[PDB]
């Protein structure tokens, strides 16, 4: 049961070097082919390259002179370096494995968002949204940078009936909202809280939704 | 360089019925007895997941509802029957020839029954107000089809600037869509008006669906 | 290290046949195809074999001259050269592709070569 | 066969002084995209890969060796030529069967 996990900065200045790490657990990187892939904000996927079990590398033609992939077999980690990044390198970066069972990228990390910008990290303000068989409540997460932000309700206990909307960028600040619908029997009888995290600013907020 | 072209770029298929999507390669992806052409499903907020490898092999644990065929430069992914959970974008990928590439993706929509948006409007919170800002929020939730328009009115008059909108992808459970619209004003502007209104126009309704509150 | 160890120098009478070998180590033998190459002054690709299933693909120029086989248990590839003439005097190499697929087909690891002299 | 790809390699041989930069070209008779590798071969030794996929350097090869090109025109450039570089050089295409080599260049 191999597991891959990307880590590294979420925000990088233009012209600087982007560096990411993939930490592998379960399987040794001395087997298979260890890949980096990215997905642009417009959703297109681009294959970047690999380092093989033997240490050989394959760099995709369009990145061939800007990229380096290295590894550390003792730590079971491998690494991406992308040089002289521009705003066009903003993307979600994935590490994935190819085994010779399928010759296909068969196991994938959850991906890490990297933003290339000179804009500054800014924490969000979180506002409760409060007002029939069902009642809909919400949270407004406003004015943060960069992506991403995570929102849960009741620490994830409240799952169904949740909509968290894609963030909208305005003046280099993002704004996102999330709605949750619950039986009117349960609110405000039982508390409803949104939990908002923004790793880039080390922000974690809990906002209890209170009747007006 | 080799290019993978997927078609259609999007399609809507009824629950229980067949999706057929195509991938054409500009150069042959066959080599050494294999077609190095693989198919992936990518749901929002998730990484791609391998469905079919080497053109026609079911990846371990994947439903046999998914099947792949083809060779050389012409490939097909078939999904039959389509289920709600299949709302996703589908990608082909080749690794026979440098440069390795992905197709541009095919978005599969589930064609379900029409459903009117549930609209809810929310005044600015005292938290934001005490800080000098005023955002009025409107949720237009669980509708189908995805086409929808929102209009804001303040004291009966349409307001256009200060509005930001966001749309979800299709829900994996009920096959609906949702939209969020925020009208942001200054506290001072917000306090000199009484009626705040958000209106949805949608195929399911001959009149706009309106929610309001007076300050 | 990947290593391909080929058999020793051969002296072959005209019209006779010879079978060369290439013992592979330092990688999983059956996960890679094997190529063979002839050098008299330039190089010519003879053909390739998949050790996993024995499938072969030949350069048409050598279809009537070379026969490739493998012994999976011993991680050894073989090339039989038939009915030799002086034109077959050459150094023959075995070589392993870098990786899979066509992009990976380039010959990354070579044997030391085997001299064959017809006389 | 008439459809076999021909790799036309030039020059046939050359001489230079230590420290100099030299270039070897290969012209493919058909579009082979980037599926071209370059090899070095010393007398009595097997070929050793220098460059693969037209422009990537094989493990351990010094950056004095550079490859460029795509389609039909490919170049191997050797900068700061050293005594160790006196040898034969060959290109290989692996775009389509049969795989074929350039005729070679002797650097002496």
Residue numbers in the entry:
A (entry chain H): 1 to 82, 82A, 82B, 82C, 83 to 100, 100A, 100B, 101 to 126, ...
B (entry chain L): 1 to 27, 27A, 27B, 27C, 27D, 28 to 211
C (entry chain A): 1 to 40, 43 to 52, 52A, 53 to 82, 82A, 82B, 82C, 83 to 100, ...
D (entry chain B): -2 to 105
Q: What is written in the article reporting this PDB entry?
A:
AP33 is one of several bNAbs that bind to a highly conserved region of E2 (residues 412–423). AP33 potently neutralizes all genotypes of HCV in vitro. We use AP33 as a template to make a structural mimic of its antigen-binding site (paratope), by exploiting the ability of the immune system to generate antibodies that are specific for the paratope of another antibody. We applied a mutagenic strategy to identify a specific Ab2ß, B2.1 A, which requires the same binding residues for interaction with AP33 as the viral antigen.
To verify that B2.1 A is a genuine mimic of the E2412–423 epitope, a Fab fragment of AP33 was co-crystallized in complex with a single-chain variable fragment (scFv) of B2.1 A, and the structure determined to a resolution of 1.8 Å. The asymmetric unit of this Ab1-Ab2 complex was composed of one molecule of AP33 Fab and one molecule of B2.1 A scFv. The structure unambiguously shows the positions of all the amino acid side-chains and of water molecules at the interface between the two antibodies. CDR-H3 of B2.1 A complemented by water molecules mimics the shape and character of the E2 epitope, even though there is no sequence similarity. B2.1 A mimics the shape of the antigen particularly around the critical E2 residue W420, which is deeply buried in the Ab1-Ag complex. The hydrophobicity of W420 is conferred by several aromatic residues in B2.1 A while W420 itself is mimicked by FH98 of B2.1 A in the Ab1-Ab2 complex resulting in the loss of the hydrogen bond. The shape of the antigen around G418 is preserved by the side chain of B2.1 A YH100A, which forms extensive contacts with WL96 of AP33. The polar character of E2 residue N415, which is deeply buried in the Ab1–Ag complex, is conferred by the sidechain hydroxyl of YH100A of B2.1 A, which also provides a hydrogen bond to YH50 of AP33. Interestingly, the interactions of L413 with AP33 are mimicked not by an amino acid residue but by five water molecules in the Ab1–Ab2 complex.
